[PDB]
């Protein structure tokens, strides 16, 4: 028994979402509850809904508007849809199966939790198609300055200093992804004070998807 | 109704540690099947517990669950380094399964660390594009749970607030970032903002002026 789940990766904000899971090793059509769990990048987990063979759903009520879960004995699959999608949408998104014993020809029961899980698969809801960094020089008032990139998407930048020239003390953030679908993210350098009068420092930022390049130089205002 | 569990928890290799999963409707009993999921760090979530205390056969032995006080407990006992990560109890409310907030477990490996903190106000090019964003750095921190709070003034900032969860460095310590956007005129507005770093009860402040 193991569970496939796939769609899209990308949404456009106020769109639907949808994903599909395929079954195999056992049929959409037995003893099982079908779920949904998500989770946004670094937070916990939370739970979707879940739908028997026959056409019984639950869903969470904070979600209840605009889910909708459906089984396709068809093609032995199960599917989530959600509505009017925002950032807040933005999650790995799990299929996962749970059996219901029915010691009775029809009884539904809680005696077993999910117990086997898709591996998952990552939905970005943003606005933006692909969207260069602004890059701000983070002044020093040893001595640390940086460099701040803001808003850019999709994910990958990266940053050097001086070219790469300089190596040491270099520490580049990991990105936040902000609620306006849009990441964010910063680097900084340890310097020695009594050089901030005569070596450059220039932070050298580079966002593949949009082929951007930006250099900016950080002073000492 | 609202599952609360510990927000992070530490052990030492061959320790013991138990989580507690409590609801807001009332005790705990076995008619919630409260149900433990173990997530590693970049995994799937893995039942380990369900129905109070029923083992997966993927289960290892050093994992064991009880109800304990009106709350769902899952203790674990002679703590191997692999078992870090971050574990969620799960309950069911006339059919509604409800997630805990999950805790985090640090098994311990290095000495504890607080968190370096440096803020950086707007720079001038950012005001002169009409724009603003303060950048709190908190780095080299162990264990790698921190709450960030913001002050404009003396006054707690909700709006504008996002803040990344910890990652881990090179050296085994923790970074993390916090991000305060605000109009020229916000900032302009006050005679400072600080950000405030919480870290195993101890709280450090960066403060700075326009």
């Known amino acids: 028994v193991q569970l496939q789940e796939s769609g899209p990766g990308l949404v456009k904000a106020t769109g639907t979402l949808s994903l599909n899971c395929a079954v195999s090793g056992a049929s959409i059509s037995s003893s099982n509850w079908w779920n949904w769990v998500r989770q946004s990048p670094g937070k916990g987990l939370e739970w979707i809904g879940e739908i028997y063979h026959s056409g019984t759903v639950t869903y969470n009520p904070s979600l209840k508007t605009r889910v909708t879960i459906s089984v396709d004995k068809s093609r032995n699959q199960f599917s989530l849809k959600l509505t009017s999608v925002t950032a807040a949408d933005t999650a790995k998104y799990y299929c996962?199966?749970?059996?219901?014993?029915?010691?009775?020809?029809?009884?539904?029961?809680?005696?077993?939790?999910?117990?086997?899980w898709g591996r998952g698969t990552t939905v970005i809801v943003s606005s933006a198609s692909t969207k260069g960094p602004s890059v701000f020089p983070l002044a020093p008032s040893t001595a640390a300055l940086g460099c701040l990139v803001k808003d850019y998407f999709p994910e990958p930048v990266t940053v050097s200093w001086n070219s790469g020239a300089l190596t040491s003390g270099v520490h580049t953030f990991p990105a936040v992804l902000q609620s306006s679908g849009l990441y964010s993210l910063s680097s900084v350098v340890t310097v020695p004070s009594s050089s901030l009068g005569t070596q450059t420092y220039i932070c050298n930022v580079n966002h593949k998807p949009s082929n951007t390049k930006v250099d900016k130089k950080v002073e000492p205002k | 109704t609202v599952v609360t569990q510990e927000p992070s928890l530490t052990v030492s290799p061959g320790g013991t540690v138990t989580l507690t999963c409590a609801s807001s409707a009332g005790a705990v009993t076995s008619g919630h099947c409260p149900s433990w999921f173990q997530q590693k760090p970049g995994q799937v979530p893995r039942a380990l517990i369900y129905c109070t205390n029923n083992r997966q056969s993927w289960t290892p032995a050093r994992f064991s669950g009880s109800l304990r006080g009106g709350k769902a407990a899952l203790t674990l006992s002679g703590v191997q380094p692999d078992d870090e990560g971050d574990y969620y109890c799960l309950v069911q409310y006339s059919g509604v399964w409800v997630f805990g907030g999950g805790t985090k477990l640090t098994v311990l490996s290095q000495p504890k660390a607080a968190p370096s903190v440096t803020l950086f106000p707007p720079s001038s090019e950012e005001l002169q594009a009409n724009k603003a964003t303060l950048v709190c750095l908190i780095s080299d921190f162990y264990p790698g749970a921190v709450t960030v709070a913001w002050k404009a003034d003396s006054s707690p900032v909700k709006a504008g607030v996002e803040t990344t969860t910890p990652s881990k460095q090179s050296n085994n310590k923790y970074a993390a970032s916090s991000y305060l956007s605000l109009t020229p005129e916000q900032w302009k507005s006050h005679r400072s903002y600080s950000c405030q770093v919480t870290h195993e009860g101890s709280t450090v402040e960066k403060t700075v002026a326009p």
């Open positions: 996962a199966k749970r059996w219901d014993s029915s010691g009775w020809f029809s009884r539904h029961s809680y005696d077993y939790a999910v117990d086997v």
